[PDB]
């Protein structure tokens, strides 16, 4: 049951992970995860701002 | 700020950096502010026509209680040292008045804005390291 | 893919003539043995399988010694021994520098291996129970310890090694971590722009990498805490570059280094024996 | 949500807002653009700068009092020390540009006043000797970004050295002619009830596509109170005017070593 | 017809020709170019200045003696007070710029003598103090177009403060490797019974994009005689060498107030 | 997925204003 | 993920690598690389020089 993922590359490219134990919090680091919404924190508004458009109007 | 907590957990940076200032005089203060971002290598600028040479915008004081002027990444390296550095050096902001602030009576001649820093989405970190921020007696 | 192979060839009466050239252009001579001698046909099947540039740098050399001690330390100095801060470089040696400076720029991965020897100081003070060390890589800005037991040393975002003295040397891998596209082995430059009319000092100024370079710091204790009998250590640092790119090919180092720099000393700028004569077999 | 008192205009590294502004004119209806080879002159392959030149400079401000007469600047003379601009200019032979011109006033719902803003192609003004025609230093002409100012009075020199400056009288525009018809010019009014703000769009004007900018201004710009500044609780009030000035398109001919223009 | 020894070029307002070339080398194999959008670094609009700095700069002449021991200069350092290539270089914090390097020597068909021309990305030279190392001024560091001399001694100073320029020792390069092995650098030799020009054309070289041209030197220009002047009917004759260099494919960015180093 | 490329841009005069806000908004 | 590759050969030949690392920069040395240009150092010359003819025409 080995996953083969990407590498992070260096200077100039995959890897093989087997896991060994039953439970899961036995595994090594979380695969890199991009996911980001900025919005939530940066712009929570409820009526949409268009940054062309005055923002009071 | 908030900006500047994170990066002392890195060692390098890059991007855009975007300062948002909201004055908050009287409605009736009018007026017009000079904002520069100029690249380091040159005098650093202490009037406004050294200042208008560099990246600026002019703020009209108006319904619209907020101006924002970038610093756009304009870098030598890739990446910036999160120390002070000269071979890293970033430059100079500066702000001057472009016109005045205009009041009519009965109104204060004094007041302030708020200066705000943020990064862009071209912003990014890296090389985790812990920060000169926090520490314990031992 | 092998050297060259020699082709088969006899004499030549020719205004064909790969003898002659003219290195004034920039060229340097081109022509083979099949040009200039009757050859036999030779099939080549060597290599230059081992200078490739990952074979000529496919070491581990020493590139510094640390010292550090555990003994009960009741002076400013004593305590400044049960820990020790390097600035991390290859400078303080020759051999891997010089092969480095065969180019200007290179691009690589770095494998760093440590060998951590012991001895006692004294024989009359009982014995010492083993000992764990602390290697902590410290990027630049991170707090830099005062004390062997500081809180710089809990490491929560440094990466620290924590090694048993008689343990397998320890090794990790470090990515190519530069700020630029290459790491620079030569800046002909300054970190800044000295200014007409400026008050700052022009006189105590530093010229090249050293004024620009900052590779952090490692530091190192021992983990224990005083035993009776002083124990003495010597922490010897290895780089091995690895997955190496490199451009722009210099001359190598001819004559002794004197520090950091290019900067050579006067008493050895001397480096060839005279010959008894221009005849000398 | 979109308004015609609010504006951005970016060029280069600089941005300017208005949030009370009304509308902005485009001289003769016509943007700047690049020389054609169709109607190019010089024949040798342009310098055309883009973002170091083409951008927001912002000349010292002047005061608006009860008593100002008006304003006056030359172009590309009030930007010949600007920046990347000014070098641009100064090592050609030949220079071309518009402009984006950005005058900025405000005050407050209680102060009241207008402000005439023009842009005058070939705008020649009056000597102050009447011992001769014509006579105006090159150093007199030329002020840079200080510009100069209009007088309500015509007083000529005795001396004919003494009166080589221009006679910039209001009413007849500094050059003989009722500032009443300056409106035939491209033009906005800040009147300080309405907007706080002035944006011209000037494309290059000339009877030739190119020509010599250290010895000719194309435009001049004038800043005329049309009605007085009042504010009631202080008549010896002063609010700042400030003019900032994009050049626009910018193309030069003719690279030699700098011009250096004599200073007195 | 067409020769190895007959070159023309050409760039902006300037032409260079020779009749008696050795070829023409291209540092690396790769002519300069553009900085491409997949490698770029500063995000602003980049200056382009084209042909008001992509074109022939003639610096001061040296003089070639039978006791010459050589002379260098650094780029873009012996460029920098050159027409509008200095003021965009100064103007802007980032620069990048490639070059046609043309040196000049002419004699006789009885004269002899041969001079190295190499090209040495990042040259780097030891200081004259063994008080400190790494030990340069700025001002010594960057001469501009009068570069500087080689001598065949080594005398570093007393004081420290007295050592603050390079030890160019002929022998050691200025640099503690052996001469002889210069070539490893793109180069031309100027042999005096074969030709009496070298050209070099030089990529943009560095391990970034684009890099502060005020605080680093990309390229040295390093001139050797490999063989003493010699001249039969006057072994005290002199013969100017004259180095002419174009930049090529410049780009600028981070435009603000110019750049004005420091003169002593 | 990478940190935000920059698009070639060149001026603008125009009644779009992205340079004005109003933080009270909480944006 | 296993790769199987020719050994350098001996006196007298395929040897499996498997990747254990989720960097790149954690894998054993770079294969052999055969590259290489010498004339951008021994032949940098604008005009193509042919060996039989005159260097300078
Ligand atoms: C009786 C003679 C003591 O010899 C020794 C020791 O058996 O203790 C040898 C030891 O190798 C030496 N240590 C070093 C680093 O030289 C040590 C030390 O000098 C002294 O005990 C305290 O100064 O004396
Ligand atoms: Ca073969
Ligand atoms: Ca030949
Ligand atoms: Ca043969
Ligand atoms: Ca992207
Ligand atoms: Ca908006
Ligand atoms: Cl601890
Ligand atoms: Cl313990
Ligand atoms: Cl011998
Ligand atoms: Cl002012
Ligand atoms: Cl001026
Ligand atoms: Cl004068
Ligand atoms: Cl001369
Ligand atoms: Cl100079
Ligand atoms: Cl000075």
Redesign the pocket.
């Known amino acids: 049951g080995a996953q083969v993922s990407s590498q992070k590359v260096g200077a100039h490219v995959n890897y093989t992970t087997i896991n060994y134990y039953k439970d899961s919090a036995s595994n090594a680091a979380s695969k890199l995860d991009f996911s980001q919404d900025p919005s939530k924190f940066t712009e929570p508004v409820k009526d949409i701002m268009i940054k062309t458009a005055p923002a009071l109007n | 700020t908030m900006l500047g907590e994170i990066l002392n957990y890195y060692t390098h940076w890059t991007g855009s950096l975007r300062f948002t200032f909201l004055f908050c005089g009287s409605m009736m203060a009018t007026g017009k502010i000079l904002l520069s971002y100029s690249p380091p290598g040159a005098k650093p600028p202490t009037t406004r026509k050294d200042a208008m040479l560099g990246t600026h915008i002019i703020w009209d004081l108006g319904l619209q209680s907020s101006c924002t002027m970038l610093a756009p990444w304009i870098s030598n390296t890739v990446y910036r040292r999160c120390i002070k550095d000269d071979f890293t050096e970033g430059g100079y902001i500066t702000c001057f008045y472009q016109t005045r602030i205009v009041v009519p009576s009965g109104t204060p001649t004094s007041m302030f804005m708020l200066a705000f820093v943020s990064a862009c989405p071209d912003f990014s970190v890296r090389l985790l390291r812990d920060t000169n921020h926090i520490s314990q007696r031992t | 893919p092998t050297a060259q192979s020699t082709p088969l060839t006899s004499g030549v009466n020719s205004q064909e003539v790969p003898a002659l050239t003219a290195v004034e252009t920039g060229a340097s001579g081109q022509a083979v043995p099949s040009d200039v001698i009757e050859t036999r046909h030779v099939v080549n099947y060597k290599t230059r399988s081992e200078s490739t540039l990952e074979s000529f740098f496919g070491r581990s050399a020493c590139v510094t010694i640390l010292e550090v001690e555990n003994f009960n330390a009741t002076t400013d100095a004593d305590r400044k021994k049960q820990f020790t801060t390097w600035a991390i470089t290859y400078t303080d040696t020759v051999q891997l520098r010089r092969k480095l400076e065969f180019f200007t720029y290179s691009r690589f991965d770095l494998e760093m291996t440590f060998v951590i020897t012991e001895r006692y100081?004294?024989?009359?003070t009982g014995h010492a129970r083993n000992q764990v060390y602390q290697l902590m890589y410290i990027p630049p800005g991170a707090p830099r310890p005062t004390a062997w037991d500081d809180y710089t040393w809990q490491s929560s975002s440094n990466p620290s090694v924590f090694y048993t003295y008689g343990s397998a040397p320890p090794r990790m891998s470090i990515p190519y971590v530069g700020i630029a596209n290459a790491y620079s082995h030569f800046y002909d430059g300054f970190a800044r722009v000295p200014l007409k009319d400026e008050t700052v000092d022009s006189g105590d100024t530093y010229y090249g990498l050293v004024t620009i370079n900052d590779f952090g710091t490692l530091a190192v204790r021992v983990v224990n805490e005083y035993n009776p009998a002083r124990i003495?250590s010597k922490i010897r640092v290895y780089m091995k570059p690895k997955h190496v790119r490199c451009w722009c090919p210099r001359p190598p180092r001819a004559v002794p280094y004197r520090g950091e720099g290019v900067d050579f000393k006067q008493d050895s700028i001397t480096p060839l024996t005279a010959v008894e004569n221009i005849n000398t077999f | 949500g979109y308004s015609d008192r609010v504006r951005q205009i970016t060029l280069g590294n600089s941005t300017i807002t208005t949030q009370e502004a009304a509308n902005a004119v485009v001289a003769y209806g016509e943007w700047p653009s690049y020389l054609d080879d169709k109607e190019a002159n010089p024949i040798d392959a342009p310098t055309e700068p883009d973002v170091s030149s083409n951008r927001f400079y912002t000349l010292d401000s002047v005061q608006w009092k009860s008593t100002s007469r008006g304003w006056w600047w030359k172009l590309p003379d009030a930007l010949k020390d600007m920046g990347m601009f000014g070098q641009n200019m100064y090592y050609h032979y030949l220079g071309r540009s518009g402009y984006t011109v950005h005058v900025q006033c405000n005050a407050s719902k209680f102060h009241q006043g207008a402000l005439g803003v023009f842009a005058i192609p070939e705008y020649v003004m009056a000597c102050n000797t009447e011992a001769k025609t014509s006579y105006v230093s090159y150093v007199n002409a030329n002020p840079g970004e200080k510009g100069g100012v209009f007088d309500n009075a015509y007083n000529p020199s005795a001396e004919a050295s003494e009166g080589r400056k221009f006679a910039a009288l209001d009413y007849l525009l500094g050059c003989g002619v009722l500032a009443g018809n300056a409106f035939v010019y491209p033009h906005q009014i800040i009147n300080l009830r309405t907007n706080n703000s002035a944006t011209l769009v000037l494309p290059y004007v000339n009877s030739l596509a190119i020509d010599c900018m250290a010895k000719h201004n194309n435009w001049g710009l004038v800043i005329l109170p049309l009605c007085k500044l009042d504010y009631a609780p202080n008549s010896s009030t002063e609010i700042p005017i400030t003019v900032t000035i994009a050049p626009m398109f910018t193309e030069f001919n003719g690279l030699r070593n700098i011009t250096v223009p004599a200073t007195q």
Chains 1, 7 share one sequence.
């Not at chain 3, 100081?121 to 009359?124: K, L, Q, R, T, V």
Request: no cysteine; glycine share 0%; charged share 0%.
């Open positions: 100081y004294a024989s009359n003495t």
